A paper describes a structure:
The multi-subunit Type III-A [name]-Cas effector complex (Csm) exemplifies this principle and is in addition regulated by cellular metabolites such as divalent metals and ATP. Recognition of the foreign or cognate target RNA (CTR) triggers its single-stranded deoxyribonuclease (DNase) and cyclic oligoadenylate (cOA) synthesis activities. The same activities remain dormant in the presence of the self or non-cognate target RNA (NTR) that differs from CTR only in its 3′-protospacer flanking sequence (3′-PFS). The single-stranded DNase (ssDNase) and the cOA synthesis activities reside within the Csm1 subunit and the RNase activity resides within Csm317–19.
As all Csm subunits were present immediately before making the cryoEM grids, the reason for the lack of Csm2 in the 2.9 Å apo complex is likely due to its dissociation from the complex during plunge freezing. Nearly all particles that went into the reconstruction of the apo structure contain no Csm2. Though still not clear what conditions led to the capture of the apo LlCsm in two different stoichiometries, it indicates instability of Csm2 associated with the apo complex. Thus, when Csm1 is well ordered such as in the apo state, Csm2 is loosely associated with the complex, which could lead to its disassociation. In either isolated or the CTR-bound state, Csm1 is active while in the apo or the NTR-bound state, Csm1 is inactive in cleaving non-specific DNA. In contrast, when Csm1 is bound within the apo-Csm RNP, it is immobilized in an inactivated state.
Residue numbers in the entry: 1 to 81, 92 to 111, 116 to 296
Write the structure that this text describes.
RNA sequence: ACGAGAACAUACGUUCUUUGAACCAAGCUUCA
């Protein structure tokens, strides 16, 4: 298991339904879509989808990190006996679970709002506004992968000089990436456990959804939007809405998701990575 | 096949109008 630490050199915009509103981090849907667009840029989207569908690449949602501290979302535990807390460090999960344990503050950056206009010559200009998020100086995001492949690294390097998120051609989203294989996180992931914490925006297939929802504390998340290409349907069109579990969810039974197809009435398919990525705890 | 594509926070706008560096003031005091 390896890491992809994303040190950002620019404001980002990772909107949820907006241009004016943004979140601090992105998801596996967006990174899979970005890598698929970089694959069709260099003609390897048949290879990349065959790698991703056969579980040769498996990446979680991008998660925050401050100095030598990797963070994950606050796992929804259904324990019996920190509402403003949202991110607990991944190494501190055992003694966060063993008792009511806050050691240091969580600061990643702060949100912003860019004020832009759409200038007209002989007409009054149109204001609009882009909500952004600027990271702090020695912070960023990381993505957990395992058994990395040279195609994944080539596509990541091509995505590095293209932009991640929204409004990327208009000033945002540039970053640099690094692998930096760690030893503590891989030992934390290799250990089994009775309860497993989801880490990507997954959705089980229709023959395992009942098995997945047994002793489950989940949160559904609507993950859709408009199709970003040029060869799809000669006008802007919204893909199929897919409701996946949120990345902080916690399950008893394991599952492997699917790369669902959300675009069918077009010249090329549109995919949505809802494969499952788990972390075992006790 | 990234809640995404496209989109200048842009256009018009004199740091400008008043007002004396004036008023007071033996180159003079003792010298065949």
């Amino acid at each position: 298991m390896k890491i992809i630490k994303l040190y950002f050199e620019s404001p980002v915009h990772f909107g949820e339904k907006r241009l004016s509103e943004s979140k601090i981090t992105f998801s596996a849907d967006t990174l899979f879509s970005a890598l698929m667009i970089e694959a069709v840029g260099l003609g390897k989207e048949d290879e990349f989808y065959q790698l991703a569908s056969n579980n040769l690449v498996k990446f979680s949602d991008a998660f925050p990190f401050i100095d030598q501290y990797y963070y994950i979302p606050k796992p929804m535990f259904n324990l019996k006996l920190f509402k403003k807390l949202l991110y607990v460090p991944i190494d501190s999960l055992e003694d966060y679970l063993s008792g009511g344990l806050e050691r240091e503050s969580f600061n990643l950056g702060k949100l912003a709002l860019s004020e832009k206009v759409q200038q007209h010559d002989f007409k009054d200009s149109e204001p609009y506004n882009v909500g952004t998020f600027t990271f702090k100086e020695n912070t960023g995001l990381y993505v957990l992968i395992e058994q990395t492949h040279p195609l994944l690294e080539e596509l990541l390097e091509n995505l590095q000089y293209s932009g991640i998120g929204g409004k990327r051609n208009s000033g945002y989203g540039k970053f640099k990436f690094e692998i930096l294989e760690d030893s503590d996180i891989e030992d934390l992931f290799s250990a089994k456990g009775n309860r497993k914490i989801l880490l990507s925006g997954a959705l089980p297939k229709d023959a395992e959804l009942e098995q997945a929802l047994k002793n489950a504390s989940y949160l559904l998340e609507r993950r859709g939007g408009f199709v970003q290409s040029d060869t799809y349907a000669t006008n802007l069109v919204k893909k199929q809405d897919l409701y996946v579990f949120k990345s902080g969810s916690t399950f008893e039974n394991s599952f492997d998701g699917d790369i669902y197809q959300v675009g069918k009435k077009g010249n090329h398919p549109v995919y949505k990575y809802a494969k499952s990525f788990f972390l075992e705890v006790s």
